[PDB]
Ligand SMILES: *[C@@H]1O[C@H](CO)[C@@H](O)[C@H](O)[C@H]1NC(C)=O
């Protein structure tokens with residue numbers, strides 16, 4: 001994110017700074033070569049010459065896009081062809097009958113120079129799998145009102161040892177609302193209960209100030 | 219065990235296309251840069267093309283540039299070579315070889331070391347209707363010691379013909395040379411055996427020619443004529 | 445020969461624990477009270493459809509069923525999935541197998557994973573390149589049919605392959621019976637019990653009483669009149 | 677566009693002695709790493725070739741320790757500590773620096789013996805070449821050493837070219853001798869015109885080139 005030798009580095013759905021602290025289920029690296037600034041043409045939900053026929057994107061792409069120049073390498077060979085995003089249209093039979101593939105004229109023409117494109121498609125809440133950035137595991141403190149980051153799950157509470165008989169495959173448990181009422185801990189495989197830290201509004205009981213300034217607090 | 223099987227050979231007239239395919243089985247196909255290497259008939263090897271571990275081609279030979287087109291597929295473990303606008307000079311065997319150093323295992327990436335080789339196909343190109351062989355005699359010179367006599371096969375296409383002598387028994391003293399190629403593409407070769415001149419004027423000697431595609435087995439009784 | 449699938453086909457859709465709670469979820473289930481296809485193995489293993497995943501129930505006291513071949517081409521063309529179980533090895537493979545009809549011994553490739561007196565029932569699903577297999581083994585003593593009763597269906601394994609499958613074929617050992625059913629997108633109400641195991645479920649899409657049970661969100665309804673849907 | 681050469685072009689080796697071969701280039705293959713990129717390859721008679729040495733001198737896997745590689749700059753050498761009966765065939769050196777790669781013409785290694793002289797025979801066209809317009813003459817040379825030998829086709833002192841071809845066989849396993857055979861083809865317009873036709877052989881074992889001639893019309 002700080003080796004800015006690339007051309008375009010735009011993350012959609014994720015801010016680049018906060019990438020170091022998230023355990024993703026999986027990532028998909030999709031790579032290709034396209035000429036010109038067709039980086040604008042390939043946009044989530046947008047249209048374009050390449051987008052409408054080659055490689056589309058969804059409406060909620062929680063991923064990132066990278067692209068840079070390849071003039072030092074590519075200078076006939078490069079070719080390009082209403083479809084669902086993330087598609088392989090390997091059916092390229094000639095269709096009266098015309099050319100299926102139009103060719104990029106590799107040559108030092110910025111105006112029409114080729115480019116390398118990579119797309120990093122994350123899924124971070126699609127599986128129990130864990131893929132995180134650099135971080136240090138710490139010793140968990142029990143029965144103290146603490147804030148916790150269990151491989152992405154960030155919360156605050158008091159972590160009482162639990163016996164909730166989770167089945168051998170469940171990552172974590174919950175209840176009526178979106179209330180993580182337990183968790184299975186990595187590195188120890190134990191069932192930890194979560195309890196809210198105490199709160200409750202105070203109240204002030206007082207006789208009139210024209211009688212006394214003493215006060216009690218409930 | 220590592221296997222490299224290629225397919226696509228067969229006679230093809232000049233000015234057409236072919237699509238050779240090499241399939242690999244027994245290793246992680248993505249960590250090895252493949253190569254396609256020709257082998258002329260009765261000549262030295264010659265590099266043709268290659269492909270790195272990221273489906274990025276590494277250039278073609280100087281005299282072939284313009285027509286050949288390599289492509290690779292890691293999902294199906296395959297390497298294809300499309301070939302267009304042939305000429306009569308592109309008849310040869312074709313091996314698909316593998317690199318040695320796995321990528322990022324130690325400066326740059328590796329490309330050398332063509333270690334494992336499949337048994338290549340036999341691509342050929344020509345324009346000639348299948349014709350049968352013509353058998354010719356080579357009588358003894360009738361000039362000491364042991365004199366040689368033989369039979370010569372001319373104007374046959376394609377290979378291979380098989381020549382034996384005395385129906386198969388005579389084996390000590392036979393010689394058969396590889397099929398030389400001619401002007402019009404119709405091949406030619408010969409076989410010769412050396413026998414005592416004393417056994418030249420009364421014995422029996424027959425050479426037997428077998429051509430499989432033309433479905434023939436011709437007999438030739440060779441003796442001096444004067 | 446068809447069979448009445450009493451209540452089979454309810455598995456765990458989500459990997460998050462619940463407890464003593466009625467959760468209504470829409471998923472790809474096997475509708476209550478369907479006609480499951482029978483197959484007898486006297487003197488039988490044709491190609492079946494794989495439209496929407498498959499509920500495969502195998503009753504066994506001889507252990508001759510061995511696995512499954514999934515694909516569309518089935519002759520060294522595409523990565524046809526294969527499950528094979530022999531006396532020590534449970535191999536899941538996706539090679540392009542070169543043997544046309546029923547590969548086994550009686551009495552190209554991209555992935556590999558190695559691990560009437562019983563009822564082993566499996567469900568096969570394929571979503572977004574994840575092939576999910578949910579299994580369960582149950583002890584029975586009955587020789588005739590698929591029994592009457594309820595049980596959960598534990599989610600066992602997932603495989604990252606991602607290919608279009610339209611047909612599948614079971615396989616045996618050369619020298620039994622089983623049942624198959626297909627899946628439809630229903631909306632169940634599951635009763636997660638105290639330990640968190642599905643003890644009952646109602647299919648809202650079957651008959652009016654189940655529809656009202658699903659709207660009220662309970663398994664008993666008082667007398668009266670309840671507004672449920674809209675004809676249009 | 678780099679051209680190699682090898683030396684010697686063809687050498688006879690005898691089992692039980694060291695063998696040396698030199699490969700020379702046009703541009704020194706010293707890369708920035710300090711590694712020479714030359715490779716040494718072997719081909720057995722009638723099989724697919726096999727790898728001998730990669731990266732200049734690093735011995736390949738699975739080959740015995742009887743081979744050695746050395747050299748640098750533009751000159752490299754391969755030397756077998758001990759040669760045996762299973763070390764015959766063709767050797768090549770291949771670059772790996774500047775694409776496209778290249779293979780040397782190839783060194784032909786065979787088994788040596790005592791020098792022997794060829795036996796020479798001539799063969800005129802039969803009567804089947806008198807009713808078919810095509811006339812063929814065959815000169816035969818058998819049981820000679822070494823590989824080098826050459827032929828003139830002579831017709832009334834008027835040397836010809838182009839139309840005469842030749843072919844040779846493999847080395848005989850037992851007595852290690854070679855056989856050559858040349859053919860001359862022509863029409864039915866000049867064959868019945870010139871009188872004396874001769875095959876001339878030049879070889880080391882003969883004091884003078886030997887001329888075997890026949891005359892037309894016996
Ligand atoms: C972390 O290391 C400990 C032993 O050092 C081990 O018990 C634990 O299983 C490891 N974590 C995982 C996910 O394997």
Ligand SMILES: *[C@@H]1O[C@H](CO)[C@@H](O)[C@H](O)[C@H]1NC(C)=O
Nearest residue numbers: 165464637638639640641643
């Ligand atoms: C499952 O539930 C029953 C009662 O609901 C209870 O015995 C226990 O919580 C579990 N049974 C076991 C562990 O045998």
